[PDB]
């Protein structure tokens, strides 16, 4: 029996939206004491400045020592330069958690923030789109345990779908990110008498929700062992390892250059382009090595090569 | 340069549904101890009465001092007079939070209630529709901190889409509301040895989800210059041309009927938030903006939006 090289391909949209600057407004909340929304200021607890008259800061609580707890969002308008890449991590703004000791019962339990901008599309037509952002807050009781006395924010993976050149696109919150790292979280824990700034990562893709690019298939369809013997994948690995052949990692998530692969024992594979499209070269190919086994017990190794093609939005 | 006056229009379905009485039945719950679902009684912890046989009451826990904690729902049928108006706040009933001390671990952490009713059409056919109501429960540990010993409930923004005259409609929960106030909360905090009564606001509209009426446009598209770039520098509710306006660009600006957001590049969205009973039969919402050309010259104009009432038969 002989395993035969297998080919696939996946399209990733690598275009750009012309977008205005974005404006944040805290629009709603539940159960706060002395809740105030305001455009950010360089007041000590004012959350800093931004380029708009929106209300991106929100506070609550009767300070028991100095300042009120609350949240800040400061847009990344300056660095985004009127552009939203597709299938690319976008820092929409920097979210801060202002956690200070406030008298018990003084905090909201939830709040929501709008983000508005325009999309210039074709012939300078401005399509206004707003992303709702939801937050559950837990101002915990303060005890002598500083970890238990931390406050938990939870952000939701909301989206908004909008039209552009007669085609649907969906912006989508991914999560929070410790700036300069790579880890996405959807819950924050912040100490009292402390702040916590995190990038707010979002991404925008084609379709009615945001779905990583992806492709599927079977590696054994092409493999040969006769109709008198069944085959089984017994190993897979990233890269070209035919000389060695491969053992293990069947049905495990396998990292490549551009995305992750999962190969099932019966040949079924899915490959998800996870990478930013800024990391995807113009002739990108993702190679994996599987090893098949016929019923007799005879091994055989081949390759799965997937083109990762960049496309324009026009190709829709 | 000259900012010319703008004109826009947003339609609000101002009709009503013929509706039967609504029946509440607590159907599911997770992790309680001695959970009882029952029709309401004038008993001490029975939650009062209503006109159906459904189980609109749920209790749980092993009373440590007197009664069991639990969740109440008393329909607003007598007042709704068999009608569910569209684009209007609707008390579906009053939710009570019975919060009593119970032996630790004996409370539910979740519970779902179904609200069922019929919807008659022009031909009389009854189309039965049911709305699921999901609740997260936090029976917290009781300590000497009265606020930290409070119980937190969370209600979800559930919906039900139903057909009426070959057309989709969606009932959607808004949240709780202190009777008399207007603030809509999605989470309640109640003290131990205390009850908490809130109106359950819901709203039915055209389509597959519930969305407040809205319109969009660009105020600078008709303004004149060059090529000389233009920028909105102020917006405000009302007519304020004599003064002209500064600030509140990209802020939420409240009108009579709804809110406006005008962006610096002219892009605006306006959302009719008002109940439709508060929308006059020839209503118009007026905003003032002030534009600025590159040379630095200001210029004030108006943005007038008709708020039109329509019947469900119209679109």
């Amino acid at each position: 029996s002989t395993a035969l090289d297998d080919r696939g391909e996946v399209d990733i949209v690598a275009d750009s939206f012309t977008v205005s600057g974005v404006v944040a407004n805290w629009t709603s909340w539940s159960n706060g004491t002395n809740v105030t929304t305001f455009d950010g200021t360089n007041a000590p607890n004012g959350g800093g400045l931004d380029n708009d008259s929106g209300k991106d800061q929100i506070r609550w609580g009767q300070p028991a020592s100095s300042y009120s707890s609350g949240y800040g969002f400061i847009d990344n308008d300056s660095a985004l330069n009127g552009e939203f890449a597709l299938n690319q991590d976008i820092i929409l703004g920097t979210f801060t958690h202002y956690n200070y000791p406030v008298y018990s019962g003084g905090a909201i339990t939830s709040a929501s923030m709008d983000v508005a901008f325009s999309v210039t599309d074709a012939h300078g037509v401005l399509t206004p789109v707003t992303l709702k952002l939801n937050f559950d807050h837990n101002e915990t009781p303060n005890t002598n345990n500083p970890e238990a006395s931390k406050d938990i924010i939870k952000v939701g993976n909301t989206n908004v779908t909008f039209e552009n050149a007669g085609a649907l696109y969906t912006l989508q919150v991914i999560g929070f990110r410790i700036p300069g790292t790579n880890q996405i979280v959807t819950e924050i824990r912040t100490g009292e008498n402390a702040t916590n700034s995190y990038e707010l990562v979002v991404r925008v893709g084609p379709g009615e929700g945001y779905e990583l690019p992806s492709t599927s298939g079977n590696v054994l369809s092409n493999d040969v062992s006769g109709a008198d013997v069944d085959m089984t994948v017994v190993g897979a690995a990233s890269g070209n390892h035919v000389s060695s052949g491969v053992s293990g990692s069947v049905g495990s998530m396998i990292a490549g250059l551009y995305g992750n692969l999962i190969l099932l024992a019966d040949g079924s594979y899915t490959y998800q382009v996870t990478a930013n499209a800024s990391s995807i070269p113009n002739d990108a190919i993702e190679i994996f090595t599987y090893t098949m086994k016929d019923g007799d017990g005879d091994t055989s190794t081949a390759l799965l090569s997937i083109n990762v093609n960049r496309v324009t939005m026009a190709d829709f | 340069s000259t900012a010319l006056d703008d004109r826009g229009e947003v339609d609000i379905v101002a009709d009503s549904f013929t509706v039967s009485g609504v029946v509440a039945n607590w159907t599911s719950w997770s992790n309680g101890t001695n959970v009882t679902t029952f029709d309401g009684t004038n008993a001490p912890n029975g939650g009062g009465l209503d006109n159906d046989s459904g189980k609109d009451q749920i209790r749980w826990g092993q009373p440590a001092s007197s009664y069991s904690s639990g969740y109440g729902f008393i329909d607003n049928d007598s007042a709704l007079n068999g009608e569910f108006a569209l684009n209007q706040d609707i008390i579906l009933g009053t939710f009570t939070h019975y919060n009593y001390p119970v032996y630790s671990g004996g409370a539910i952490t979740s519970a779902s209630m179904d609200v069922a009713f019929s919807v008659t059409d022009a031909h009389g056919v009854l189309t039965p529709v049911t709305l699921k109501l999901n609740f997260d429960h936090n029976e917290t540990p009781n300590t000497n901190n009265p606020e930290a010993s409070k119980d937190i409930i969370k209600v979800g923004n559930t919906n039900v889409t139903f057909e009426n005259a070959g057309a989709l409609y969606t009932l959607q929960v808004i949240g709780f509301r202190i009777p008399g106030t207007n603030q809509i909360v999605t989470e309640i905090r109640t003290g131990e040895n205390a009850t908490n009564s809130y109106e359950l606001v819901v709203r039915v509209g055209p389509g597959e989800g519930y969305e407040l009426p809205s319109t969009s446009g660009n105020v600078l598209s008709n303004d004149v210059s060059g090529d000389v770039d233009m920028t909105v520098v102020g917006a405000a509710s009302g007519n304020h041309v004599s003064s002209g306006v500064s600030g509140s660009v990209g802020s939420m600006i409240a009108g009579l009927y709804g809110n406006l957001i005008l962006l610096a590049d002219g892009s605006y969205t306006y959302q009719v938030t008002a109940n439709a009973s508060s929308i006059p039969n020839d209503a118009i919402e007026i905003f003032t903006y002030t534009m600025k050309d590159g040379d630095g010259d200001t210029s004030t104009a108006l943005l007038s939006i008709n708020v039109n009432r329509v019947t469900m038969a119209d679109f």
Partner: peptide, 4 residues
């Protein structure tokens, strides 16, 4: 008093 009690802080949160």
């Amino acid at each position: 008093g009690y802080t949160d």
